[PDB]
UniProtKB/Swiss-Prot annotation:
Cytoplasmic side: 1-305
Quaternary structure and partners: 3CL-PRO exists as monomer and homodimer. Only the homodimer shows catalytic activity. Interacts with host FBXO22; this interaction promotes the proteasomal degradation of nsp5.
Mutation effect (M49A): Does not affect ability to cleave and inactivate human TRMT1
Catalytic activity reported: TSAVLQ-|-SGFRK-NH2 and SGVTFQ-|-GKFKK the two peptides corresponding to the two self-cleavage sites of the SARS 3C-like proteinase are the two most reactive peptide substrates. The enzyme exhibits a strong preference for substrates containing Gln at P1 position and Leu at P2 position
Cross-link (Glycyl lysine isopeptide (Lys-Gly) (interchain with G-Cter in ubiquitin)): K5, K90
Name under which the protein is recorded: 3C-like proteinase nsp5
Effect of Q189A: Does not affect ability to cleave and inactivate human TRMT1
Entry function: Cleaves the C-terminus of replicase polyprotein at 11 sites. Recognizes substrates containing the core sequence [ILMVF]-Q-|-[SGACN]. Cleaves and inactivates human TRMT1, preventing tRNA guanine(26)-dimethylation of tRNAs. May cleave human NLRP1 in lung epithelial cells, thereby activating the NLRP1 inflammasome pathway. May cleave human GSDMD, triggering alternative GSDME-mediated epithelial cell death upon activation of the NLRP1 inflammasome, which may enhance the release interleukins 1B, 6, 16 and 18. Also able to bind an ADP-ribose-1''-phosphate (ADRP).
């Protein structure tokens, strides 16, 4: 037992991390089949990042300007094209370590593992969540772009995230693997504001179910509440409004646990109105919202790859 913020095994993704160099800009790229995906700002200097015209800047670039290396073995770029805010570099050889993969655009609240790399080689891995305002609180130094976020289900690596920039607030933004930014962000070095962030209510409830599973039961209350009443309380504390879909996705936890979902929301209302009172839940003094119900069921089922 015990509960931990657990990342996916990163090997299958380590096997596709290449270094992409263009002029003097160097960052990370993802080598799948005979295509290397990378952020389009690889074609920019920092003097270009204030207001870049990516079409005009890419037009004076040719295939021989891009240098792709996997560790030390090298890739011959034989084509290139810009899709939204990513560059697709067609190379001479196909990645022998290409796993079964998909490109999917995740929805807010859902989680993924980030493999943080620099110069095409991995440095760390950690689990994070796509905030309701389409940001993530990762850790990304300079050179870290092009690092990817992914989920792994049995055989399949579903890539969902490519890191692009750090907001002046200190949080991070990126695109899906088709180059479309999550949220209202542009790959431009200017002031960009994320919206009001809110807490992923269903995730907090899944984490409380995990807590009940692992022995911590002090927050377990005796009230229940209406869905509308809990939503009244949740909107005051800047929580996302709970829908019947959320209650349905919490069904397995509510059944293994024996605690009806609405009573768990009653306990959560009590925690929001009275605080945690100096105690902890699963080693945390705050209400954790970066576990989806599926993450809890994974850690309790020992789902493997
Ligand atoms: N010559 S470069 O094109 O600025 C550059 C050079 C090396 C590595 C990176 C960058 C990037 O931009 C970049 N993404 C980005 C996107 C929009 C606005 C600013 C940035 N960055 C943030 C990190 N500091 C440099 C500016 C990621 C990198 O890993």
């Amino acid at each position: 037992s015990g509960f931990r913020k657990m990342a996916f095994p990163s090997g299958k993704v380590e096997g596709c991390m290449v270094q992409v160099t263009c002029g003097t800009t160097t960052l990370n790229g993802l080598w799948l089949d005979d295509v290397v995906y990378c952020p389009r700002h690889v074609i920019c200097t920092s003097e270009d990042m204030l207001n870049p015209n990516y079409e005009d800047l890419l037009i004076r670039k040719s295939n021989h300007n891009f240098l792709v290396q996997a560790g030390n073995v090298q890739l011959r770029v034989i084509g290139h094209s810009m899709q939204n805010c990513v560059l697709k570099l067609k190379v001479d050889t196909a990645n022998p370590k290409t796993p079964k993969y998909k490109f999917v655009r995740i929805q807010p609240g859902q989680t993924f593992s980030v493999l943080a790399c620099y110069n095409g080689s991995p440095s760390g891995v950690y689990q994070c969540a796509m905030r309701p305002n389409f940001t993530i609180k990762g850790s990304f130094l300079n050179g870290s772009c092009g690092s990817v976020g992914f989920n792994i289900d049995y055989d399949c690596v579903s890539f969902c995230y490519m890191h692009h920039m750090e907001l002046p607030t200190g949080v991070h933004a990126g695109t899906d693997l088709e180059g479309n930014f999550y949220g209202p962000f542009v790959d431009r070095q200017t002031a960009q504001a994320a919206g009001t962030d809110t807490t992923i209510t269903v995730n907090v409830l899944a984490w409380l179910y995990a807590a009940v599973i692992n022995g911590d039961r002090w927050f377990l209350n005796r009230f229940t509440t209406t869905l509308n009443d809990f939503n009244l309380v949740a909107m005051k504390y800047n929580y996302e409004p709970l829908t019947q879909d959320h209650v349905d996705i919490l069904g397995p936890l509510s059944a293994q646990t024996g605690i009806a979902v609405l009573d768990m929301c009653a306990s959560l209302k009590e925690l929001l109105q009275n605080g945690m009172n100096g105690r902890t839940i699963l080693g945390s003094a705050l209400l954790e919202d970066e576990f989806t119900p599926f993450d809890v069921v994974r850690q309790c089922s020992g789902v493997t790859f």
